[model samples]
Target: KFTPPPASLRNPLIIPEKIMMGPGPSNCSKRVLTAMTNTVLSNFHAELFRTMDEVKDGLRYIFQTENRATMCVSGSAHAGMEAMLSNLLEEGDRVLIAVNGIWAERAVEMSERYGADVRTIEGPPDRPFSLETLARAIELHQPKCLFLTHGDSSSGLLQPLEGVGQICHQHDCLLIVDAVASLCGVPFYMDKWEIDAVYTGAQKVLGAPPGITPISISPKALDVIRNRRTKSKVFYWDLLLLGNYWGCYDEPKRYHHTVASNLIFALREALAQIAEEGLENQIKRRIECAQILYEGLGKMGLDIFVKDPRHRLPTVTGIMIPKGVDWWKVSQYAMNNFSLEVQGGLGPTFGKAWRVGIMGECSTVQKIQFYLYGFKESLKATHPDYIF
Candidate 1:
C-alpha cells in the first residue's frame, strides 16, 4: 500500500563545534573555511575556469610536481586512488603492492578487482619493507606497476620510498603511491622520488573539506595510458577524460562533469596557506607538534603504539589502550566533557589503541597543550589511580 509521507517532519542538521583530533577530518583552518563560504562563480563559466586554473597551479605547488596532468578528483582521496588504478590496470596486468597497513591492503584489493594480477610483500605494522625485499619482489613479479602508501595512518607508520622508485624503474614498473595521510605535513617529492603516480586527500594537512582528491601522473605512466590493450572499464574514473578536463592537453577544456566549485575554492585557499607558510616549515611544525604530544602522553604513563620513533608518522600518533580500562568510555568522556575527539583503533588493533592526529591547522602548540591538559583532567576523573 502506498501512503503519503509526513509533510512537516523536521530535524536539525547542524552539529556543534568539535575539536577534531582523530585520524582524519581534522579541523579546517579559518582561511579554508572562509574560502568555502565565499561566493564563487558558476561552474564552466569563464571566470570559474580561470579559478580552476589557479587551483591546478596550487596543486602543482603543493605536490612539488609540474606534471601537466595535475588536478583534483571530485571526491575523497579513495576516488583519486581508484581513478589512477582503474585506468592503468588492464586485464592480466601485474601489480606488486607493498602492504604494511590497511591502506596498502585496500590498494591490493582494488587492483585485484580491476583484474590485475596482484602480488604483495607484507611488512610488519610498525615497519616498512626493506629495499632488498622490494627489489626481489619486483624481479620475481615483473609487475606493470608498484603500489605503496607513504604514511599508514592506522598504524602510525611512515613508509620510506628512498630507493623504491629506482627499483621500480629498473623493473619497468610504474610506481604508484598513496600519500593521503601525509602530504604537506610530511616530506614528499613526487618528481625527486620518481613516483609515476601519486594521490592525496584534502582533509588532512591540506586543511580543506573532504571532497577533493589531488593526483599527479608522470610522463612514463601517461605513455602507458596512451597505448592500452583495451578500453578502460570505468568511465567516470577514466584518466583520458580527466586529462582532457584538467587541461593536460592543448585543446579546449571539455565539460566532462560539473566539479564541486566551492570545494575547489577551499582547496585553493588551503594551498595558498601552505604556500605562505612554506611546505618545509609546515612539515617541521607537524613534527614539533607530534613531539609535544608524545611528551605529554608519556607524562601520563602511556606508551605509544608504534615503538620505533623513526617509523612513526608525525601527523598521527597511535596510543596503546590501558589494560582493564574501558577505551570507549575514555573517548566518550573526552568528547562529552572536553569537546575533544580522538579515534579508536581499526582492524587488528581494535580496542587496543587510540589514534590521535596533529594535522594541518590543528597541529598547533596551543591546541596540543589544551588536549594534553584535557586528557590529564579526564584521566584523573575516570581513573584516579593512574599517574605518570
Candidate 2:
C-alpha cells in the first residue's frame, strides 16, 4: 500500500515560461502545448490508429523518405539510438563509430554492449572529420554498420554527408545516423543521402517534449533485421515487436506496452506546425538566427568553439568562455535574472565552451537578440573587465 501524499505534493504545480536557449527541450509552440491537453485516448483506439497513420506520413515528409517503416520510439533520442543499433546488430558483427565528441563515446559504449566488434575514427571535439577520412575508415574496417551523429551539440559540429552514403554502400556497410540535434533545423534528406536508418529527437529541433524519437528506415536496413540469425537481445528495444505495435510490419498492430497518449498529441501538433510553417523556411530561420548570434558574439569580442564555420552547427552554437570569467556564473545570471538558458558545454568540451540552441519555436531573430542581451548582461556582472 502507498502512503498519503504530503501537503507540498498536494499543491498545484507552477512552471514559468522559460526562453529555452540551451541544447534541447526548447519552448513548445502554443498550438502544440494546447494539443497536449486533449482528452487522453487509448493506444488501441480507432482515433489513435488513424492519428498514427497520419503521423507516419508526416514523418515521411519530414525525413524526406519513402520507406514504410517510419515511426517514433516511445522514449528519448538516446533510446532511439540504442533501438536502431540493437535491432540491426548482434554478437560478432562489426561496427564503426565516427567520434567527434562525447556523443560518439556513448555510441561506442552502446555498440560494445551489443557484443559487436567496435572500432572508431575520431577528430578533436572542435574539429569534424572529412567525408574522405570517413570513407577511408569504412574501407579499412569494412564493418557491417557505421554510426555517425549528424549534428554533435557538444562540439557544435555538423558532419557532412553529401556522398558519404554511397561510399558506405560501396564498402557493403549500412549507415545509421543519429540526427537528434539536427533534423528540421538543418537540411536533411534521408533518401537522397542514402541513409539506411536515421532517427531524430522531437525535443531538439521539433519544439516538442523529449519523449519521442521519430525514425525512418530504408528497405536495406529492414532486410538486414529480417535476416538476422539471432533475435535482438533487448526486448524493449526490439523493433520487430515495436514495428508490429507501430503497424510498420506485415501483421496487424498489437499491444507492446502502454504508450503516453499526450506525448503523441504533442508530437502531432509540433509536426503539424512544421508542415504549416514550411520546413525550408524554418531551416532558413535557424541559419539566419545562428548567423545573427555568431555575428553578435563576434562583435562582443567572443570567440567560437568550432574553428571552421562551414562545419559549425546552426542549431547549437558553442561559444568560448572568456579569460577570467566563470561560465557557470554566466549561465546562472541568464536564468536567474532573464529566465533564459545558455548552458555550458558537455562531455569533452566541459568548462571550455557554452552551448546555445537556436531551434524551431526559438529559432527567431528576436530570440537570438534576447540571448545576446542576456550574454551581454551576464558578462557585465561577472567580469569587471568586460566593457558594455
Candidate 3:
C-alpha cells in the first residue's frame, strides 16, 4: 500500500527575504503590493475590458506615446521582443542588429530563427556603437528593420538612439528598441524619436512584479503585421490576436485569452506612482542617484567599468572587481553580513566586475548611502590592510 504524504508537504514554500539591489526583481513599492493584493477575480466581461483599457492609458503615460497599439504582453521582456520580431519579420526579410551586449545578441539569434538575413554591428562592451558605424551598416545592408537595446543591463551601458532612428528612416527600415531597463529611468520618446516599435519589462524601472511585458507599436509596424504573408510563429504571442484583444483592430474585442489580473493591477499601480512623481522627475532621480553612487565609489578608490558617463545607464552601475579579491566572495559577504544583494557580471564581463542597481524605488539617497556603507565594510573585512 502506498503511504500518505506528511502534513507539512501541503505547506507553501518559504523564501528568503532579500534586499534586492541586483539587476531586477527589485523591491516592489508598498502601493504596488497593495494593488496586487486588492485585485478581485473576475471573468472576461465589459467591465474587465474597461480595467484593461485603463492599463493601456497608464502605459501610454509612462512610455510617453500616443500610439493606440500600446498594451501589456503576458510574459517577461524576452516575450515582448519575440512578439515584435515574430510578427514583423517574414521568412526572407533582412534585419540589422547592434551587438554591444548580451541582449542585442539575443535579438540577433531570435531574428535569425525567423529565417531573416540577420547582420550585426559590434561595439566594445563598455561602449556603444557610434552613429557613423550604424549609418554605414544601414547603407550597406539596407535591412528591412533595425533592432537595438536602449539600456543593456548586462554591461550597464546605454546605447545611443538619437540619430540612429533618422538613419533607419532614411534607409526605409523600421526601428525597434528594447527599453526593458531604461523605460522610466531614462528619457524615451517614441514619436519624437520615430521608433517604429518599443518594449519593456514591468520589473526593472517600473517597480512591479516580473510578469507583464509592455509594448507600443507605431502605424508602420502595425501595417507590416497586418500584411504579413504567414501566420505568427507562436500562437500565444501572435500580435494579430493580441491587437484584437487590445482593441487595435477595427472590430469588437474578442476573447483572445484570460490575462493575469493581479499582474495587471501591479502594473497599473506602478504607472500611477510614476505619474504621481512626474516622469521627468523620476528620470532625474535615477540620474542623480547614479551620480551619487559614482562619486561614493570614486572616494573608495574603486574603478568603474564604464569610462564614459554618457554611456552609463542611470539605473545600474558596473564596478570593476579589484585584483586579488574573490568577486563572488565579496558579494556573498555583503549579502550575509550586511543584508544587501548585488549581482556578479555577465557575458564578457563575468568575474571581471560587480553590477549594482539603483533603480525605481531604490534610487533614493538613503538606499545609496546604505549600499556605500555596506560595500566599504565588506571591502575592509575582506582586505584588512587596504586603504580607502
List TM-score per model, in order.
0.96, 0.97, 0.96
Predicted structure 1: clash tally: 0
Clashing pairs for model 3 are none
Q: In candidate 2, what are the lDDT values of residues 1-388, reduced to their tens digit?
A: 8888788888799998788998887888888888779878887898787778888988998899998889888899888888887888889998999887887789899988989899899787777778888988998999999998889888788888878889989988999998888898789999999999999988888988878788888899989999999999888867778878889988988888776778888888888888888889999989999999999998998888887898888998888888788999888888989998878988866888899998757888998998999889987887778753
Cα lDDT tens digits, model 1, 19-103, are: 9888798888887887877676665687677777888888788778889888778789888888888878899999998887888
How high a TM-score does candidate 3 get? 0.96
Give me candidate 2's TM-score against the actual structure.
0.97
Instruction: Give the number of the best model, judged by TM-score.
Output: 2
- lDDT for every model? 0.84, 0.86, 0.85
Q: In model 1, which runs have C-alpha deviations exceeding 4 angstroms?
A: 1-9, 39-41
Runs of candidate 2 with Cα error greater than 4 angstroms are 1-4
Of candidate 2, the 10-residue stretch with the lowest lDDT total is: 379-388
Higher-TM-score candidate of 1 and 2: 2
